[PDB]
Amino acid sequence: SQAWQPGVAMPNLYKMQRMLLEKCDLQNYGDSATLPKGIMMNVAKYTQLCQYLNTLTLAVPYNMRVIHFGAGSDKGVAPGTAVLRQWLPTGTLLVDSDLNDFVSDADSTLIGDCATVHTANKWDLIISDMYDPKTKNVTKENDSKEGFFTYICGFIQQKLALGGSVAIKITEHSWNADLYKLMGHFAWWTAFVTNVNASSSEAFLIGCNYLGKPREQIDGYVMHANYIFWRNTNPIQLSSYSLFDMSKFPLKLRGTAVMSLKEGQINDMILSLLSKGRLIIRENNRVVISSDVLVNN
Amino acid sequence: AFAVDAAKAYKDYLASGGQPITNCVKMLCTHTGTGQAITVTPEANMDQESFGGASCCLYCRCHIDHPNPKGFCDLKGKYVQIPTTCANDPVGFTLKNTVCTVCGMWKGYGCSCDQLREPMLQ
Ligand SMILES: C[S@@+](CC[C@H](N)C(=O)[O-])C[C@H]1O[C@@H](n2cnc3c(N)ncnc32)[C@H](O)[C@@H]1O
Ligand code: NA
Ligand code: NA
Ligand SMILES: [Zn+2]
Ligand SMILES: [Zn+2]
């Protein structure tokens, strides 16, 4: 049974299929997990995401840099950011961002469209929970979405350190073909479904160990159809069981090496170290970030 | 000389029957922690709940300046342990209570610095 796991990762065989897209129809739709007393759904969801990320080869350098997009909520607080700061080593730098103002435990918070966020530095881990509420207000033909996903694709290709990882929230309707294509630029990737929210088409697209080039050519439209086929045919039982054992929750501080190598020095030995979560390639300059202010009368 | 006294205003609001500030972020933890008041990671014991600090700070939540020259917050970016009997109003608890500068426990809720001398134990 997968009920005692934090969630379920899409089996590799689905990535090699060529499914036609169709509606995501979940058998366990409407169901609900038993949330521990006073625990918010997003604390439970991020806790299970972090419980699963613990099982991967994440690079965890000293002075690790983490950026969290879509960290705000209609509550005005940042539940996911509070979980990431609990999970990450105490010395890690955590910056979060959202379209709407919110109160956060992050080292720095940027308010505005993610398209307005600028940074001269590379990051070791990108977490995104961005989701447009208009995605359910009006249902449209399920094409690749090009709002904040275009920014995320650009941010991955320009501001993610080699060896870095990402967890980007998608749903049946909130997805992007270019983002699936970019999953082929990591040593490994998957679509992870938290057990507490298994009644939703939501998943986190996890790219583990960025290689800065494609190890596999992925057709994003076909890969999203493959993801839906998995969700439609292998029901996931709602479960909060993994939330009750927090003894091995903290991300282990591996102290992964950080080197500033040029693009012409990336050989097969380096790609091999990046692929094992044993190396981060980026400069270590002062972390500087900002959000544009649109000025008008 | 005028200065808004948010702390006093929240206490008077509570005394009048006002609904405590909600959506303080409670964390999942083992409840086998040190029990210290404000920590870098959740440290709740069996008689406490751990919350994200920023969500339990009146000044952070009301978008008001912190009552000190530097405007520094002692809760933001940390975890505050609240006794379970007071977990319904973490903002009110942090305002009405003081952390012991010696043991790091809440005064009257963990600090044993003022208890009679214990006989020595082998
Ligand atoms: C599901 S909510 C995030 C919940 C949050 N992660 C938590 O811990 O509760 C999705 C968020 O994405 C944000 N968002 C949507 N489009 C955005 C954009 N273009 N730029 C920045 N934030 C955006 C919304 O403002 C909203 O707060
Ligand atoms: Na931590
Ligand atoms: Na109570
Ligand atoms: Zn504060
Ligand atoms: Zn004391």
Residue numbers in the entry:
A (entry chain A): 6800 to 7096
B (entry chain B): 4271 to 4392
Would you copy out the relevant sentences from the publication that reported this structure?
To facilitate structure-based drug design, we conducted an X-ray crystallographic study of the SARS-CoV-2 nsp16-nsp10 2′-O-methyltransferase complex, which methylates Cap-0 viral mRNAs to improve viral protein translation and to avoid host immune detection. Nsp16 is a 7-methylguanine-triphosphate-adenosine (m7GpppA)-specific, SAM-dependent 2′-O-MTase that is activated upon binding to nsp10 (16, 19). The 2’-O-methylation of coronavirus RNA that is mediated by the nsp16-nsp10 heterodimer is essential for preventing recognition by the host to evade immune responses that are triggered by viral mRNAs.
The two heterodimers interacted by the C-terminus of nsp16 and as well as the N-terminus of nsp10. We refer to this crystal form as the “large unit cell”. The overall structure of nsp16-nsp10 in the large unit cell was almost identical to the small unit cell structure, including the bound ligands SAM and Zn2+. Alignment of nsp16 from the large unit cell (chains A and C) with that from the small unit cell (chain A) showed substantial similarity with a raw root-mean-square deviation (r.m.s.d.) of 0.37 Å and 0.42 Å, respectively. One of these flexible regions was a part of the loop formed by the residues Asp6931-Phe6947, which was disordered from the residues Lys6933 to Lys6939 in chain C, a likely explanation for the structural differences. There are only minor conformational differences for loop 1 of nsp16, however, the L8–η-3–L9 loop showed a more “open” conformation in the large unit cell and a more “closed” conformation for the small unit cell structure when only SAM was bound. Thus, the heterodimer is the most soluble and stable form of the 2-O-MTase complex, and the dimer of dimers in the large unit cell formed as a result of crystal packing.
